Amino acid sequence: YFPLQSYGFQPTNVGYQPYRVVVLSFELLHAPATVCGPKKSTN
Amino acid sequence: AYTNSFTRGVYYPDKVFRSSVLH
């Protein structure tokens, strides 16, 4: 035995449906910024 | 086989400048 289990996703299924999920995790550190909002810089 | 570490093996804990302070 191994712990793997498989779903059986059918179009007729609502918590029974497949769900796509993305988790955005944000690296707050005092290192250089590299991912930023589109807000434009000034002089 | 071994040797003494002395006062070796210390690093800046975070990327923040600090000066004249006992952190």
From Swiss-Prot, chain A:
Changing N13T: In strain: 19B/501T. Changing F2S: In strain: Lambda/C.37, Omicron/BQ.1.1, Omicron/XBB.1.5, Omicron/EG.5.1. Residues 30-43 are annotated as: Disordered. Changing F2L: Increased resistance to neutralizing antibodies and human covalescent sera neutralization. Changing Q10R: In strain: Omicron/BA.1, Omicron/BA.2, Omicron/BA.2.12.1, Omicron/BA.2.75, Omicron/BA.4, Omicron/BA.5, Omicron/BQ.1.1, Omicron/XBB.1.5, Omicron/EG.5.1. Changing Y16H: In strain: Omicron/BA.1, Omicron/BA.2, Omicron/BA.2.12.1, Omicron/BA.2.75, Omicron/BA.4, Omicron/BA.5, Omicron/BQ.1.1, Omicron/XBB.1.5, Omicron/EG.5.1. Changing G8S: In strain: Omicron/BA.1. Binds to host ACE2. RBD also interacts with the N-linked glycan on 'Asn-90' of ACE2. Cleavage of S generates a polybasic C-terminal sequence on S1 that binds to host Neuropilin-1 (NRP1) and Neuropilin-2 (NRP2) receptors. Interacts with host integrin alpha-5/beta-1 (ITGA5:ITGB1) and with ACE2 in complex with integrin alpha-5/beta-1 (ITGA5:ITGB1). May interact via cytoplasmic c-terminus with M protein. May interact (via N-terminus) with host bilirubin and biliverdin, thereby preventing antibody binding to the SARS-CoV-2 spike NTD via an allosteric mechanism. Attaches the virion to the cell membrane by interacting with host receptor, initiating the infection. The major receptor is host ACE2. When S2/S2' has been cleaved, binding to the receptor triggers direct fusion at the cell membrane. When S2/S2' has not been cleaved, binding to the receptor results in internalization of the virus by endocytosis using host TFRC and GRM2 and leading to fusion of the virion membrane with the host endosomal membrane. Alternatively, may use NRP1/NRP2 and integrin as entry receptors. This is Spike protein S1. It comes from Severe acute respiratory syndrome coronavirus 2. The gene is S.
UniProtKB/Swiss-Prot annotation, chain B:
Binds to host ACE2. RBD also interacts with the N-linked glycan on 'Asn-90' of ACE2. Cleavage of S generates a polybasic C-terminal sequence on S1 that binds to host Neuropilin-1 (NRP1) and Neuropilin-2 (NRP2) receptors. Interacts with host integrin alpha-5/beta-1 (ITGA5:ITGB1) and with ACE2 in complex with integrin alpha-5/beta-1 (ITGA5:ITGB1). May interact via cytoplasmic c-terminus with M protein. May interact (via N-terminus) with host bilirubin and biliverdin, thereby preventing antibody binding to the SARS-CoV-2 spike NTD via an allosteric mechanism. Attaches the virion to the cell membrane by interacting with host receptor, initiating the infection. The major receptor is host ACE2. When S2/S2' has been cleaved, binding to the receptor triggers direct fusion at the cell membrane. When S2/S2' has not been cleaved, binding to the receptor results in internalization of the virus by endocytosis using host TFRC and GRM2 and leading to fusion of the virion membrane with the host endosomal membrane. Alternatively, may use NRP1/NRP2 and integrin as entry receptors. This is Spike protein S1. It comes from Severe acute respiratory syndrome coronavirus 2. The chain holds residues 27 to 49 of 1273 of the full protein.
